[PDB]
């Protein structure tokens, strides 16, 4: 058996000094089965490849153990050196159609049965027969979400300054005209104290002044009403940045340097993209950025190197569940199941299909899904910086008025 290292399905960890792995337990205190794993020590090329014994465990190991219990099997697991599913490639003497990776290893006779996440495809089925899928999951889009904290901090004039200057000019002219009217018939600062008390409610304070007071009281509230209306509108209208709304996203239909997204290597998604009637620019946009593994791809996505990634929906959902910093958008498309890679002359077709269907109908699949894929689930500046600035300004004004009154009292009473 050859198995591909898949993080949500096949966990691979180094063995201990004795050559075995630890006996861990789940939340229910059950012994987790582990099988000795054989594979290369380093996946990257140009390295001292050593076939050290690993210890791979996960989702498919339970199904493999169930199959070995139902029918007599002596299975040994293996890891593909290149870490790829395997499709048709081109080499020297390009007039050759040969399969590489896991599919090529299976065709070469090295392996007889494959228990690994492999998407069923027409090209793969034209040469290797598959069995009934374990579960039906399509492919989706994975994009790292941002955390909106603040925008347009309101300290003294976040919107405009000419409006504030006009308001200041208006209050100054209304104050001086009120003083002139009072003098013609509040000579001291009592008039301006009353005006400021009317502007800002603090409980401090013939017919000529009545109309001025009435119009000033009416005019005072519209400014704050407009300010709070604008604040509410700007809080309601946020960034709402959406990366991908679906397969038919017009933004995805065009290549952009700002948003880079691609798959890892050749797979069923690659064949689906190849067999497109009018989606041609996708290959030119994606062939310039390729990786070697899904772990590296998701690490790059986390490190903001990439913006979106395409893979099986179940893998993305599990990654989002285990890491709340990532979210999955879009909808299911090109939905297809999994399969088992077996040679056409293998007499184990029915003997495996019946067991798979029995396990599916007896609730083993849902139990494994619950116990392996559903472990767990999931202003900074605007109201802080402006508050700090206001507090500093208030402290400065308090000190200034303190020294001002200290000098003024001495000057008045010398």
């Amino acid at each position: 058996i050859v198995t591909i290292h898949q993080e949500p399905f096949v966990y691979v960890k180094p063995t201990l000094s004795d050559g075995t792995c630890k006996e861990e337990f789940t939340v229910n205190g059950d012994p987790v089965k582990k099988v000795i794993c054989t594979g290369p020590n380093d996946t990257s090329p140009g390295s001292p490849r050593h076939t050290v014994p690993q210890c791979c465990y996960g989702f498919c190991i339970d199904l493999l153990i169930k199959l070995a219990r139902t029918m007599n099997f002596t299975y040994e697991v293996h890891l593909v050196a290149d870490g790829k599913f395997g499709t048709q490639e081109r080499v020297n003497n390009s007039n050759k159609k040969e399969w590489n990776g896991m599919m090529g290893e299976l065709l070469s006779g090295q392996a007889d049965m494959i228990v690994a996440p492999l998407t069923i495809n027409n090209e793969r089925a034209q040469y290797i027969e598959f069995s009934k899928p374990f579960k039906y999951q399509g492919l989706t889009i994975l994009v790292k979400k941002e955390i909106p904290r603040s925008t347009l901090d309101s300290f003294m004039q976040p919107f405009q300054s000419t409006l504030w200057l006009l308001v200041g000019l208006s209050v100054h002219v209304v104050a001086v005209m009120l003083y002139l009217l009072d003098r013609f018939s509040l000579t001291l600062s009592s008039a301006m104290w009353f005006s400021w008390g009317v502007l800002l409610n603090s409980g401090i304070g013939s017919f000529s002044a009545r109309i001025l007071g009435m119009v000033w009281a009416g005019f005072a509230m519209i400014i704050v009403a407009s300010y709070t209306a604008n604040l509410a509108a700007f809080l309601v209208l946020d960034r709402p940045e959406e990366r991908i709304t679906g397969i038919n996203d017009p933004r995805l239909r065009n290549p952009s340097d700002k948003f880079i997204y691609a798959t890892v290597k050749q797979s069923s998604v690659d064949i689906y993209f190849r067999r497109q009637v009018c989606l041609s620019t996708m290959y030119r946009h994606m062939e310039k950025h390729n990786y070697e593994s899904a772990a590296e791809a998701i690490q790059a996505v986390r490190d903001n190197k990439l913006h979106a990634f395409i893979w099986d929906s179940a893998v993305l959902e599990f990654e989002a569940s285990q890491k709340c910093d990532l979210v999955t958008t879009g909808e299911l498309f090109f939905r297809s199941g999994f399969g088992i890679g077996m040679r056409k002359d293998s007499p184990w077709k029915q003997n495996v299909s019946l067991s798979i269907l029995k396990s599916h109908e007896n609730g083993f699949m849902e139990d494994l899904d619950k116990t392996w894929v559903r472990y767990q689930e999931c202003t900074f500046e605007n109201m802080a910086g402006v508050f700090m600035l206001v507090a500093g300004g208030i402290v400065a004004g308090i000190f200034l008025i303190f020294i001002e009154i200290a000098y003024k009292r001495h000057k008045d009473a010398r």
């Binding site: 919107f159 409006l163 308001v167 009217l181 109309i211 119009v215 519209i222």
Partner: peptide, 25 residues
Amino acid sequence: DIDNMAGVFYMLAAAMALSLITFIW
């Protein structure tokens, strides 16, 4: 925004008229 100038200027005429009325009376 732009309408704020119109709004503030709308009441200025009424305030000036009231001031003239109370000055002449």
